Amino acid sequence: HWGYGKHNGPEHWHKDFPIAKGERQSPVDIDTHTAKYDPSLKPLSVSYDQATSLRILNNGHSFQVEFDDSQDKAVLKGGPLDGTYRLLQFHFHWGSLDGQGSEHTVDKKKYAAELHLVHWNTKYGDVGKALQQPDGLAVLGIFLKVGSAKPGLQKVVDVLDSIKTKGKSADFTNFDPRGLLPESLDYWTYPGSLTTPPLAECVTWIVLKEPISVSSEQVLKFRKLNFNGEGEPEELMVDNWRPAQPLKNRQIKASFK
Ligand SMILES: NS(=O)(=O)c1c(F)c(F)c(S(=O)(=O)CCO)c(NC2CCCCCCC2)c1F
Ligand SMILES: [Zn+2]
Numbered sequence: 001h002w003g004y005g006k007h008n009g010p011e012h013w014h015k016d017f018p019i020a021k022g023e024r025q026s027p028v029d030i031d032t033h034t035a036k037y038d039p040s041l042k043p044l045s046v047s048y049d050q051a052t053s054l055r056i057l058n059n060g061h062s063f064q065v066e067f068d069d070s071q072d073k074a075v076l077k078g079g080p081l082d083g084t085y086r087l088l089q090f091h092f093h094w095g096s097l098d099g100q101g102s103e104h105t106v107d108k109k110k111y112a113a114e115l116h117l118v119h120w121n122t123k124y125g126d127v128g129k130a131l132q133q134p135d136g137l138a139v140l141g142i143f144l145k146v147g148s149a150k151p152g153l154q155k156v157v158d159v160l161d162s163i164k165t166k167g168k169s170a171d172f173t174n175f176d177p178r179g180l181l182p183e184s185l186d187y188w189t190y191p192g193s194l195t196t197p198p199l200a201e202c203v204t205w206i207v208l209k210e211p212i213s214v215s216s217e218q219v220l221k222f223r224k225l226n227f228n229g230e231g232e233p234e235e236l237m238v239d240n241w242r243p244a245q246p247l248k249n250r251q252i253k254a255s256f257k
Contacts, residue, residue, distance in 0.1 A: 002016065002017075002196075002197050003061070003227060004061070004227070004239055004240045004241075005235075010242045010243060013197055013199065016197065017197045017198055017199045019193070019198075019199050019200070019201060020199050022193065022199070022201055023201070023248050023249065024191050024192050024193055024201045024248070024250065025192065025193045025199065025201075025245035025246070026103070026104075026192030026193045026194070026195050026203060026205060026242075026245060027102075027103035027104040027105070027192070027195055027205075027242060027243075027244055027245065028104065028190065028192065028244050028245055028246075028247050028250075028252070029104070029105045029106075029107070029108055029244045029247075030104055030105065030106045030107070030188050030207065030252055031107065031252070032106060032107055032254075033107075034252070035188055035251075035252040035253060035254045036251060036252075036253055036254065037253075037254045037255075037256065037257050038253040038254065038255070041079060041080055041189070041253060041254075041255045042078045042079060042080075043078055043079070043185065043255075044076070044077075044078050044079035044185045044187060044206065044255070045075075045076065045077040045078035045079070046076055046140070046178075046181065046185065047074070047075050047076075047077070048074050048087070048176065048177050048178045049178075050073040050074060051067055051073055051074035051087060051175075051176065051177055051178075052067060052068040052073055052074075052173070053065060053066070053067055053172050053173055053174065053175040053176075053177070054066050054067060054068055054171070054172065054173060055169055055170065055171055055172050056156070056159055056163055056169065056170050056171075056172040057163065057167075057168070057169040058160075058163040058164070058165060058166055058167065058168045058169070058225060058226075058237075059091075059166065059167075060166035060167065060227055060229070061196060061227070061240060062091040062092055062093065062237070062240055063091060063092070063160065063163060063225065064089045064090065064091040065089060065090045065091070065156065065172060065175065065177070066088070066089045066172075067087045067088060067089065067177075069086040069087060069088045069120070069127075072084060072086060072122070073086075073087075074086065074087035074177070075087065075119070075122075076117075076119045076138055076140060076206075079187065079189065079206055079255070080189045080204055080206065080253070081138055081204060082135070083121055083122060083123050084121070084122045084123075085119035085120060085121050085122065085137075085138045086119055086120055086122055087117060087118070087119050087177070088118050088119060088120055088127055089118050090115060090116060090117045090118065090177065090180075091115075091116055091118070092113050092114065092115050092116070092144075092222065093113060093114045093116070093195075093240050093241040093242075094112060094113035094114075094144075094219060094222050094223070094238065094239075094240065094241070095110075095112060095113070095238060095239055095241070096223065096236075096238040096239050098112045098146045098216075098219070099112070100112075100239065100241070101113040101114065101144075101239070101241055102114040102143055102144075102241060103141075103195050103241045103242055103243075103244075104141055104143075104205075104207050104244070105244055106143075111143040111144055111145055111211060112144050112145055112146045112214075112219055113143075113144035113214070113219060113222065114141055114142065114143055114144065114241070115141070115142040115143075115144060115180060115212075116139050116140070116141055116142075117139065117140040117142075117177065117180075118137060118139050119137065119138045119139070119140070120136060120137050120138075121133070121135060121136055121137070121138070124136055130202065131194075131198070131200045131202050132200070132202065133202055134191070134201065134202060135202075135204060136200075136202040136203075137194075137202050137203045137204070138203065138204045138205075138206060139203050139204075139205055139206070140206050140207075140208070141205060141206065141207040141208065142180065142181070142182065142207075142208050142211070142212055143207075143208070143211035143212070144211060144212055144213070144214050144219070145211045145212070145213050145214070146213070146214060146215065146216050146219055147213040147214075147215070148213045148215060149213075149214060149215035149217070149218055150179075150180070150212050150213060150214045150215075150218065151179065152176070152178070152179020152180050153179070153180060153212075153214055153218055154218070155175055155179075156175070157218050157221045157222075159172065160221050160222070160224070160225060161221075161224075163225075164224070164225060164226055164230075165226050165228060165229050165230040166226070166227060166228060166229040167229055168230075180212065181212075182208055182210035182211065182212050183210065184208070184209060184210040185208065185255075186208065186209040186210065186254075186255055186256035187206050187207055187208050187209060187254075187255045187256075188205075188206075188207045188209065188252050188253065188254050188255070189204065189205060189206050189207070189252070189253050189255070190205055190250050190251070190252045190253070191203070191204060191205070191250060192204075192205045192250075195241075195242040196242070209254075209256065222237075223236060223237070223238050224236070225237035227240075
């Protein structure tokens with residue numbers, strides 16, 4: 001099955017998931033000088049005041065923090081979006097080394113990691129239907145650089161040993177994802193895809209300009225995760241990122257001058 005190894009990684013995915021070679025794949029390099037400022041782009045609206053986090057799960061690829069998305073509790077609107085997008089889960093991508101790990105790149109710069117908050121469009125009723133639509137999902141992407149700790153990230157870091165292996169989960173209530181967000185909501189946006197199988201071309205990407213800083217100790221905890229389940233040799237969950245894909249016939253827009 002697919003993964004992030006040389007034997008199962010991104011260069012192989014197209015065999016099971018042929019849209020891997022499609023017209024609107026993600027991630028992409030963001031050329032900041034080419035991206036056009038779009039004065040018609042609205043402030044984004046991140047309303048996470050009622051988020052009910054519920055559970056954290058090591059899914060074997062990343063780990064994911066889950067929210068009750070059975071009502072409008074944690075929603076993304078505005079920006080490039082039409083309508084209301086409910087927060088489903090977050091997860092991260094990161095490297096073995098601080099010089100890699102992000103999926104998007106900015107002028108070819110890789111960040112140490114990238115946080116993705118996955119939301120689905122309420123006019124489609126559930127995430128599986130949303131996956132079938134060009135405007136089904138909105139993923140908010142945030143770069144991580146290594147420097148000072150992110151205090152809001154600390155609750156998340158302190159449970160990973162409890163979900164060390166694939167398929168392990170833990171309760172994870174009362175987490176405020178607001179603590180993962182930079183001062184600024186200035187962003188780039190473009191139409192793209194999931195960055196893991198099934199690679200569905202259903203995502204409006206919103207990538208924030210401002211990274212967050214996390215400490216070396218925080219990102220070291222991510223790198224002690226395992227892709228394996230317990231009993232199988234230990235395989236450090238690192239380098240779980242898809243590289244940049246062809247931009248093709250797309251324009252990346254900036255919300256900021
Ligand atoms: N980067 S991304 O936002 O396109 C992405 C992932 F990289 C990712 F790892 C996941 S995951 O944590 O759930 C592991 C997926 O194998 C999702 N999650 C969504 C996409 C997967 C299809 C199911 C629809 C909702 C979850 C996912 F959306
Ligand atoms: Zn992701």
